[PDB]
Design a protein around this ligand. Structure first.
Ligand SMILES: COc1cc(/C=C2\SC(=S)NC2=O)c(OC)cc1O
Length: 112
């Protein structure tokens, strides 16, 4: 099971998946139509995240791969976020997969 969020150049939700909806606890249509950075995740709205998304949009190829934190009622949840421009060239998809559990060997440096 993987998560996929289809957003537009404006930063709105166009297509939502069920997986993400279950992991987050929000319906697809409930989030679709509104801003995922303003409505869904108002806190995520930052120059490091949103700023990067916009830049890629203007260039016509947003390629970013990193990890993000998702604070929930059951505690924080570390997931790997990846934003890649659409294939048609008129949209953007965001892949979110729950990273591995507490590993032993040194990894995920520069932990926030
Ligand atoms: C509700 O759905 C999502 C939420 C978040 C993040 C949040 S929510 C919050 S509060 N603080 C975050 O960083 C997310 O991050 C990649 C994906 C989702 O599909």
């Amino acid at each position: 099971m993987f998560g996929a969020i289809q957003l537009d150049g404006d930063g709105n939700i166009l297509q939502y998946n069920a997986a993400x909806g279950d992991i987050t606890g929000r319906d697809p249509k409930q989030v679709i139509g509104k801003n995922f950075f303003k409505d869904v995740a108002p806190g995520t709205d930052s120059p490091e995240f949103y700023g990067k998304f916009k830049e890629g949009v203007a260039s016509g190829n947003l390629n970013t791969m990193f990890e993000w934190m998702i604070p929930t009622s059951r505690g924080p949840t570390k997931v790997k976020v990846h934003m890649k421009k659409a294939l048609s060239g008129d949209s953007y998809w965001v892949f979110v997969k729950r990273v591995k559990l507490a590993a032993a060997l040194e990894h995920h440096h520069h932990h926030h």
